[PDB]
Amino acid sequence: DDPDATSKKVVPLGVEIYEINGPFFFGVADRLKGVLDVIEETPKVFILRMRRVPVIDATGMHALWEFQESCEKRGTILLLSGVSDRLYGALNRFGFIEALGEERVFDHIDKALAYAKLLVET
Ligand SMILES: [Cl-]
Numbered sequence: 225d226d227p228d229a230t231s232k233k234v235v236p237l238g239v240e241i242y243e244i245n246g247p248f249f250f251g252v253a254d255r256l257k258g259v260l261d262v263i264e265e266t267p268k269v270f271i272l273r274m275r276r277v278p279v280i281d282a283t284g285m286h287a288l289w290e291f292q293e294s295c296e297k298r299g300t301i302l303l304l305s306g307v308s309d310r311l312y313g314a315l316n317r318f319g320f321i322e323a324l325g326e327e328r329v330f331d332h333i334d335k336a337l338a339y340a341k342l343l344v345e346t
Pocket of ligand 1: 272273274275276305306307332333
């Protein structure tokens with residue numbers, strides 16, 4: 225039924241994955257807030273799966289910025305996966321693509337996982 229389900233992938237140890245359930249508005253923002261402060265073993269790489277996310281508002285954008293800042297404070301590398309052309313446009317206009325780095329943004333989980341594995345191997 226879902227060939228790109230995280231359960232169908234090989235996820236390296238030290239890589240955490242978080243899947244967003246839909247439009248990235250206040251509901252998602254409240255759920256993502258502080259996630260890194262509640263993981264005991266801080267991940268080397270954190271992949272935010274955004275295949276279900278076509279749109280993001282100011283509240284979700286604020287939460288994504290603070291999430292990226294918590295990753296930096298933790299030495300965790302944030303990757304975005306499943307980013308559609310529409311979501312990319314919104315993230316770019318917000319200034320997030322240039323702050324994160326283009327090379328950290330992927331259109332598919334397989335590509336993000338490939339880069340995650342490379343990162344852990346270093
Ligand atoms: Cl994804």
